[PDB]
Amino acid sequence: GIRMSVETIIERIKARVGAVDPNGPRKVLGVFQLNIKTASGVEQWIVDLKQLKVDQGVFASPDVTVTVGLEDMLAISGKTLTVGDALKQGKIELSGDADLAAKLAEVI
Amino acid sequence: SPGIRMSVETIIERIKARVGAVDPNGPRKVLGVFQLNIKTASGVEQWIVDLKQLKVDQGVFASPDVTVTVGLEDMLAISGKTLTVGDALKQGKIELSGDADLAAKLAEVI
Ligand SMILES: CCCCCCCCCCCCCCCC(=O)O
Ligand SMILES: CCCCCCCCCCCCCCCC(=O)O
Ligand SMILES: CCCCCCCCCCCCCCCC(=O)O
């Protein structure tokens, strides 16, 4: 269902952020607003890769905002849809800093 | 280096053909000026790809919407459809600064 799917994606993001060494090599420092489009609404999450924290909400002046459908997010996570292909297909909507978005693309 | 020259000319001719093929009145979502810097052993090739006015000019624009910095061999491969702009980004082969919305729009339409 939608709830379980959203929970799955968020758990996965939290485990990825949890696994970062805050003092080790790091390229993606900034705050990402993540908007997950679901059939029932938008799920809004703040992925703070500066502070290495993930909270539900809408951040004021995030560095990058990423808007993506829930099914597309699951497909990216499961590697059945590459980020390159998502981009070609216009499945990812961005605003903000192109530098930080590009760096994020390198590490996903 | 004749080979660098040939490579650069081919990239630019290709971009000019593509820009010239755009219907200024048909559907368009990439309304931005892109600074394109191509690294070469002879120096950085600096080109302005103006997708607002649909013009390509050699030079450095003041305050472009997006700046794209990329190596000659990688740009050639993007140009010849041997590397997608998406594979490129995933591989760290493209340095960007500027407007992420316009960058993403470019990635979709190219
Ligand atoms: C905000 C759009 C989707 C967010 C993508 C999930 C983020 C998970 C974090 C993984 C990135 C790890 C990068 C840490 C090391 C580095 O900064 O180079
Ligand atoms: C300039 C292009 C930017 C494109 C890169 C942003 C896309 C963000 C989507 C992230 C989805 C991955 C989250 C799941 C985490 C995981 O399973 O590892
Ligand atoms: C890695 C970036 C490569 C830079 C080269 C840009 C390629 C030329 C751009 C052609 C885009 C055509 C889009 C016109 C219609 C539209 O705005 O949607």
CSV table of all heavy atoms in Angstrom, one decimal, chain A residues 14-36:
chain,number,residue,atom,x,y,z
A,14,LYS,N,16.9,6.9,5.6
A,14,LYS,CA,17.5,7.0,6.9
A,14,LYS,C,18.7,6.1,7.1
A,14,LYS,O,19.7,6.5,7.7
A,14,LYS,CB,16.4,6.8,8.0
A,14,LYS,CG,15.4,8.0,8.1
A,14,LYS,CD,14.3,7.6,9.1
A,14,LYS,CE,13.4,8.8,9.3
A,14,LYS,NZ,12.4,8.6,10.4
A,15,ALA,N,18.7,4.9,6.7
A,15,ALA,CA,19.8,4.0,6.8
A,15,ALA,C,21.0,4.5,6.0
A,15,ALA,O,22.1,4.3,6.5
A,15,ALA,CB,19.4,2.5,6.4
A,16,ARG,N,20.7,5.0,4.8
A,16,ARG,CA,21.8,5.6,4.0
A,16,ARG,C,22.5,6.8,4.7
A,16,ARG,O,23.7,6.9,4.7
A,16,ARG,CB,21.4,6.0,2.6
A,16,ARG,CG,20.8,4.9,1.6
A,16,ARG,CD,21.8,4.2,0.8
A,16,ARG,NE,22.8,5.0,0.2
A,16,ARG,CZ,22.8,5.4,-1.1
A,16,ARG,NH1,21.8,5.1,-1.9
A,16,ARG,NH2,23.8,6.1,-1.6
A,17,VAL,N,21.6,7.6,5.3
A,17,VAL,CA,22.2,8.8,5.9
A,17,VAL,C,22.9,8.4,7.2
A,17,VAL,O,24.0,8.9,7.5
A,17,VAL,CB,21.1,9.8,6.2
A,17,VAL,CG1,21.5,11.0,7.1
A,17,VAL,CG2,20.5,10.3,4.9
A,18,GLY,N,22.3,7.5,7.9
A,18,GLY,CA,22.9,6.9,9.1
A,18,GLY,C,24.3,6.3,8.9
A,18,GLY,O,25.1,6.1,9.8
A,19,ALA,N,24.6,5.9,7.6
A,19,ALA,CA,25.8,5.1,7.3
A,19,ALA,C,26.9,6.0,6.9
A,19,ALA,O,28.1,5.6,6.7
A,19,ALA,CB,25.5,4.1,6.3
A,20,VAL,N,26.6,7.3,6.7
A,20,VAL,CA,27.7,8.3,6.4
A,20,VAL,C,28.6,8.5,7.5
A,20,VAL,O,28.2,8.8,8.6
A,20,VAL,CB,27.0,9.6,5.9
A,20,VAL,CG1,28.1,10.7,5.6
A,20,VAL,CG2,26.1,9.4,4.7
A,21,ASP,N,29.9,8.5,7.3
A,21,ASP,CA,30.9,9.0,8.2
A,21,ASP,C,31.0,10.5,8.1
A,21,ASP,O,31.4,11.0,7.1
A,21,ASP,CB,32.3,8.4,8.0
A,21,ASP,CG,33.4,8.9,9.0
A,21,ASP,OD1,33.1,9.8,9.8
A,21,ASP,OD2,34.5,8.3,8.9
A,22,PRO,N,30.6,11.2,9.2
A,22,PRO,CA,30.5,12.7,9.1
A,22,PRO,C,31.9,13.4,9.0
A,22,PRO,O,31.9,14.5,8.5
A,22,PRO,CB,29.9,13.1,10.4
A,22,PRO,CG,29.4,11.8,11.1
A,22,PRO,CD,30.3,10.7,10.6
A,23,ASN,N,32.9,12.7,9.4
A,23,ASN,CA,34.3,13.2,9.2
A,23,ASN,C,35.1,12.7,8.0
A,23,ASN,O,36.2,13.2,7.7
A,23,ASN,CB,35.1,12.9,10.5
A,23,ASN,CG,34.6,13.7,11.7
A,23,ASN,OD1,34.0,14.8,11.6
A,23,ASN,ND2,34.9,13.2,12.9
A,24,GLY,N,34.5,11.6,7.4
A,24,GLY,CA,35.2,11.0,6.2
A,24,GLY,C,34.9,11.7,4.9
A,24,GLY,O,34.2,12.7,5.0
A,25,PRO,N,35.4,11.3,3.8
A,25,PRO,CA,35.2,12.0,2.5
A,25,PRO,C,33.7,12.3,2.3
A,25,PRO,O,32.9,11.3,2.4
A,25,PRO,CB,35.8,11.2,1.4
A,25,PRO,CG,36.9,10.4,2.2
A,25,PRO,CD,36.2,10.1,3.5
A,26,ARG,N,33.4,13.5,1.9
A,26,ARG,CA,32.0,13.9,1.7
A,26,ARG,C,31.9,15.0,0.7
A,26,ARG,O,32.6,15.9,0.7
A,26,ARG,CB,31.4,14.5,3.1
A,26,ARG,CG,31.2,13.4,4.1
A,26,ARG,CD,30.6,14.0,5.4
A,26,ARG,NE,29.3,14.5,5.2
A,26,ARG,CZ,28.7,15.4,6.0
A,26,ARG,NH1,29.3,15.8,7.1
A,26,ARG,NH2,27.4,15.7,5.7
A,27,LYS,N,30.9,14.8,-0.2
A,27,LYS,CA,30.7,15.7,-1.3
A,27,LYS,C,29.4,16.4,-1.3
A,27,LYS,O,29.2,17.5,-1.9
A,27,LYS,CB,31.0,15.0,-2.7
A,27,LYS,CG,31.1,15.8,-3.9
A,27,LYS,CD,31.6,15.0,-5.1
A,27,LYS,CE,33.0,14.4,-4.8
A,27,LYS,NZ,33.6,13.7,-5.9
A,28,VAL,N,28.4,15.7,-0.7
A,28,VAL,CA,27.0,16.2,-0.8
A,28,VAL,C,26.6,16.9,0.5
A,28,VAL,O,25.9,16.2,1.3
A,28,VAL,CB,26.0,15.1,-1.2
A,28,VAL,CG1,24.8,15.7,-1.7
A,28,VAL,CG2,26.7,14.3,-2.3
A,29,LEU,N,27.1,18.1,0.7
A,29,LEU,CA,26.7,18.8,1.9
A,29,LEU,C,25.6,19.8,1.7
A,29,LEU,O,25.8,21.0,1.2
A,29,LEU,CB,27.8,19.6,2.5
A,29,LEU,CG,28.9,18.8,3.3
A,29,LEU,CD1,28.4,18.5,4.7
A,29,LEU,CD2,29.2,17.5,2.6
A,30,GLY,N,24.3,19.5,2.0
A,30,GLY,CA,23.3,20.5,2.0
A,30,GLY,C,22.0,19.9,2.4
A,30,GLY,O,21.9,18.7,2.7
A,31,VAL,N,21.0,20.7,2.2
A,31,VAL,CA,19.7,20.3,2.7
A,31,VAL,C,18.8,20.1,1.6
A,31,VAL,O,18.6,21.0,0.7
A,31,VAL,CB,19.1,21.3,3.7
A,31,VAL,CG1,17.8,20.8,4.2
A,31,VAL,CG2,20.0,21.4,4.9
A,32,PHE,N,18.2,18.9,1.5
A,32,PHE,CA,17.3,18.6,0.4
A,32,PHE,C,15.9,18.5,0.8
A,32,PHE,O,15.6,17.8,1.8
A,32,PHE,CB,17.7,17.2,-0.2
A,32,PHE,CG,19.1,17.3,-0.9
A,32,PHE,CD1,20.2,17.3,-0.1
A,32,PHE,CD2,19.1,17.3,-2.3
A,32,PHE,CE1,21.5,17.4,-0.7
A,32,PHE,CE2,20.4,17.4,-2.9
A,32,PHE,CZ,21.6,17.4,-2.1
A,33,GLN,N,15.0,19.2,0.2
A,33,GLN,CA,13.6,19.0,0.4
A,33,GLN,C,13.1,17.9,-0.5
A,33,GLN,O,13.3,18.0,-1.7
A,33,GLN,CB,12.8,20.3,0.1
A,33,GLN,CG,11.2,20.1,0.3
A,33,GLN,CD,10.9,19.8,1.7
A,33,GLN,OE1,11.4,20.4,2.6
A,33,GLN,NE2,9.9,18.8,1.9
A,34,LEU,N,12.5,16.8,0.0
A,34,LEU,CA,12.1,15.7,-0.8
A,34,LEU,C,10.6,15.7,-0.7
A,34,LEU,O,10.0,15.5,0.4
A,34,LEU,CB,12.7,14.4,-0.3
A,34,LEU,CG,12.1,13.1,-0.8
A,34,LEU,CD1,12.5,13.0,-2.3
A,34,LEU,CD2,12.8,11.9,-0.1
A,35,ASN,N,10.0,15.8,-1.9
A,35,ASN,CA,8.5,15.7,-2.0
A,35,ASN,C,8.1,14.4,-2.8
A,35,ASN,O,8.4,14.4,-4.0
A,35,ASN,CB,7.9,16.9,-2.7
A,35,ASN,CG,8.3,18.2,-2.0
A,35,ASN,OD1,8.2,18.3,-0.8
A,35,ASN,ND2,8.7,19.2,-2.8
A,36,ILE,N,7.5,13.5,-2.1
A,36,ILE,CA,7.1,12.2,-2.7
A,36,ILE,C,5.7,12.2,-3.1
A,36,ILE,O,4.8,12.3,-2.3
A,36,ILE,CB,7.4,11.0,-1.8
A,36,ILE,CG1,8.8,11.0,-1.3
A,36,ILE,CG2,7.0,9.7,-2.4
A,36,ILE,CD1,9.1,9.9,-0.3
